[PDB]
Amino acid sequence: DNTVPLKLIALLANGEFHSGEQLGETLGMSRAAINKHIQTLRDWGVDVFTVPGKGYSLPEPIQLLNAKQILGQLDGGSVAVLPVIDSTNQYLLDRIGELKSGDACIAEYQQAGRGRRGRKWFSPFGANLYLSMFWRLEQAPAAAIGLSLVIGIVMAEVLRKLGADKVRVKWPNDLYLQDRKLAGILVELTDAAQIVIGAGINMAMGWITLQEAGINLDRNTLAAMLIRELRAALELFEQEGLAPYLSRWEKLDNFINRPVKLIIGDKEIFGISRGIDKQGALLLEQDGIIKPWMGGEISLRSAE
Ligand X SMILES: Nc1ncnc2c1ncn2[C@@H]1O[C@H](COP(=O)(O)OCCCCC[C@@H]2SC[C@@H]3NC(=O)N[C@@H]32)[C@@H](O)[C@H]1O
Which residues are marked as active site?
Answer: 116, 181, 301
Rounded CA gap, 56 and 47, in Å? 11
Please pick, from the candidates 116, 258, 261, 274, the single residue that binds ligand X as defined by CB under 6 A: 116
Provide, rounded to whole angstroms, the least separation between the CB of residue 297 and ligand X. Answer: 8
Report the SS3 class of residue 274. strand
87 binds ligand X (CB under 6 A): yes
- Find out whether 20 and 54 touch, Cβ atoms under 8 Å: yes
Please pick, from the candidates 18, 104, 109, 110, the single residue that binds ligand X as defined by CB under 6 A: 110
Q: Return the closest-CA partner of residue 77 out of 192, 197, 203.
A: 197
Provide, rounded to whole angstroms, the least separation between the CB of residue 30 and ligand X. Answer: 35
Rounded CA gap, 118 and 154, in Å? 25
With respect to ligand X, which residue has the nearer C-beta, 86 or 285? 86
Residue 89 known to bind ligand = yes
115 binds ligand X (CB under 6 A): yes
Pairing of strands 174-177, 49-51: unpaired
Residue 251 known to bind ligand = no
Q: How far are the Cα atoms of 7, 52, 103, 190 from residue 75, in angstroms, in the given order?
A: 29, 48, 10, 26
With respect to ligand X, which residue has the nearer C-beta, 176 or 293? 176
With respect to ligand X, which residue has the nearer C-beta, 20 or 113? 113
Report the SS3 class of residue 207. strand
Stretch that binds ligand X, among 59-67, 83-91, 156-164, 239-247 (CB under 6 A): 83-91
Residue 87 known to bind ligand = yes
Residue 113 known to bind ligand = no
Provide, rounded to whole angstroms, the least separation between the CB of residue 298 and ligand X. Answer: 12
Count Cβ atoms below 10 Å from residue 217 Cβ, excluding itself.
21
Integer-rounded Cα radius of gyration of the chain: 21
What mask, x for binding ligand X by CB under 6 A, covers residues 155 to 184? --------------------------x--x
Rounded CA gap, 96 and 45, in Å? 29
Rounded CA gap, 226 and 125, in Å? 20
With respect to ligand X, which residue has the nearer C-beta, 14 or 111? 111
Residue 254 known to bind ligand = no
18 has which bridge partners?
Answer: 56
Residue 273 identity: S
Please report, as residue ranges, which positions from 190 to 209 form the binding site for ligand X (by CB under 6 A).
198-200, 202, 207
- Backbone torsions φ then ψ of 52, nearest 5 degrees: -50, 125
With respect to ligand X, which residue has the nearer C-beta, 23 or 201? 201
Report the SS3 class of residue 204. coil
Residue 219 known to bind ligand = no
Residues comprising the binding site for biotin?
Answer: 87-89, 110, 114-116, 181
Residues that bind ligand X (CB under 6 A): 87-89, 110, 113-116, 119-122, 130-132, 181, 184-186, 198-200, 202, 207
Residues comprising the binding site?
Answer: 87-89, 110, 114-116, 181
